[model samples]
Target: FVNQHLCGSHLVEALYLVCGERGFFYTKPT
Candidate 1:
């Protein structure tokens, strides 16, 4: 969702997306 929800450009948004990705990586359903 971050790819479509967050600002898909620049630095901060990239970091935000990275964090979001990591969050999903750790929190996704088994």
Candidate 2:
């Protein structure tokens, strides 16, 4: 799987866990 969580008031935990967060321009799926 993928885990690219943010580093701010951080919201996302995993790649698929970005429900209440955000990420890079584009990420490869898991």
Instruction: At residue 21, give the lDDT of candidate 1.
Output: 55
Model 1, CA-based lDDT: 0.46
lDDT of each: 0.46, 0.44
TM-score for all models, in order of appearance? 0.32, 0.16
Give a tens-digit lDDT track for model 2, residues 1-30.
455546534433443355435553444355
Considering every candidate listed, which one attains the maximal lDDT?
1
Those runs of model 1 whose alpha carbons end farther than 4 Å from true positions after fitting are: 1-9, 21-30
Error of 1 at 22 (Å): 7.6
Superposition error at 11 for model 2 (Å) = 14
List all candidate RMSDs to the true structure.
8.5, 9.9
User: How far off is residue 22 in model 2, in Å?
Assistant: 11
Q: What root-mean-square deviation over C-alphas does model 1 reach?
A: 8.5
